[PDB]
Amino acid sequence: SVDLDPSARFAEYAHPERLVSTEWLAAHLGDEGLVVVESDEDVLLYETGHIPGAVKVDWHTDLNDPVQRDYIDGAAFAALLGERGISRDTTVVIYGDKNNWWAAYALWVFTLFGHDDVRLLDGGRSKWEAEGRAYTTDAPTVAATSYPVVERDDSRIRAYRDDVLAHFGKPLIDVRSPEEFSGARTTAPAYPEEGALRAGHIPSAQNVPWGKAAAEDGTFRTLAELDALYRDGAGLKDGDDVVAYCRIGERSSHTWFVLQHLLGFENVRNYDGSWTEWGSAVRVPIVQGSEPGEAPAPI
Amino acid sequence: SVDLDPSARFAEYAHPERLVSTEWLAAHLGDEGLVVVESDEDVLLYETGHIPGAVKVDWHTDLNDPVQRDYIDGAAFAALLGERGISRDTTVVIYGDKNNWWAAYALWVFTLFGHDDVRLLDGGRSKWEAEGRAYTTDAPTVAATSYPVVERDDSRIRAYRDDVLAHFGKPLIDVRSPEEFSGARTEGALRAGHIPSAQNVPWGKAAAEDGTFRTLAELDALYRDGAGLKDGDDVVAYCRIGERSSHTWFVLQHLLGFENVRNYDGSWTEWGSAVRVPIVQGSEPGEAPAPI
């Protein structure tokens, strides 16, 4: 069994059991019941050096249905975690590049499958590296485990296009850049498969670029800073059913994490379809400019 | 009134009233009640030379909602046709580049607004030029007419995503390239493949070398023999966008006379980026899953 990180820094958050410090992790490496998972946008980083004993999840190959636009099923999840020495009761700590952007995404997927003890290493690769902590290129050399086949739950933390169309009048957070938000750009040149034939945002969406929730050192900002950003800045109130979206669900998972686990909103869903779906969908309401715009009637 | 082209070639088709020959148009140009409309994928061709008296429709600016992914509404359509001197009773002959690929699309849009008498110039720009017939580079000075505001009808010849999800068990025609249908290409999406159970009939197979629609015999082999379509079949066609599947809609509705033909305009650009819609790969149709 694997204890919580009692660090004072985390106790102000709604779900302090969802974070650990680099100092805590350095002291727990190799402990029975703990698996450390690297999850990056840039999958090649793991091979340049990883936290010792860490395994890797590759978002290109491991987490998507290979044919359909959907995440893997319970059978594919069970085989992925078993190969990595992960059992149902294992404490998983996930860390990654770009201030745990893809780390939160892996945690979201684990949560679709109802894995209870899943935590982020606050600050990811960047704080581990700034502190001069060790990486290896040694394999985890992992003994296989049996993980149960569970049915994926898309009810609680996931939204589809019809839930979004139905959601108008309820808070909507767009986590893309202001240029994307207004309709000046759609994608990156590195990801042309993440553009769309229309530019803009979902009408009544508040723009909160996801990176605003991360400090320079890549740690999650304080409760006071987050409260400023989402409650004062974006108008969120207790009891609010919140939907977050980006270009794809991978990139709005960090904001879901922030709202579900740090600010403690009960009802937070990631609209994974995001702008790639919305901007290519026939007859969905789109607005342009830096104005959120008026909520239309629920469709 | 504007006479039907009695040409034997067209009389074997289900709706011979939907086609005119270059010979007919040359003999009927400038006749009262006839407006000729150029509709091209390459909109700049019009200024290089156009049939005398012909007006232009520009798919970049004239036919799409500027904000939403949708076609214009009745008020926009009335304004467009009014400006071009088209009345509700006007006979409209549409022609253009790429074997009337986009002419078929314009006719589709006119039919959404229920314009009765719309015809294609069999063989379009390519057969007019090949025959050495006259072009002007004059824009054709036009007196505006009043066109009525009618509600666009999306029911009869248009299909939405949820119509296609509900369609499995009934025929789908995918009009994209073999290398798009297999999922070794993709106006792309992030996913590659085709809709399971869809028969690949690349849209150009229905056109002859000279740009004209193939004989009823040749179409029957393509769509009945090749793709297994039977009388009373409810058919949906799709491409990457609805603009590019309108030609095959035209073939099935007007030439083979299928009663129920719908253009799924969302096409692969929507399908290939929709969350959790069925997709299969390789040159095989695949089997129909249960209607969703």
Author numbering:
A (entry chain A): 2 to 300
B (entry chain B): 2 to 187, 195 to 300
Provide the authors' original text about this structure.
Sulfurtransferases, also known as rhodaneses, facilitate the transfer of sulfur from a donor molecule to a thiophilic acceptor. FrST exists as a dimer and can be classified as a TST rather than an MST according to sequence-based clustering and enzyme activity. Each subunit of FrST comprised 11 α-helices, two 310 helices, and six β-strands and was divided into two distinct domains: the N-terminal rhodanese fold domain (non-active domain) and the C-terminal rhodanese fold domain (active domain). The active site of FrST was composed of Trp102, Val176, Arg177, Glu181, Trp211, Arg248, and Arg252, which surrounded catalytic Cys247.
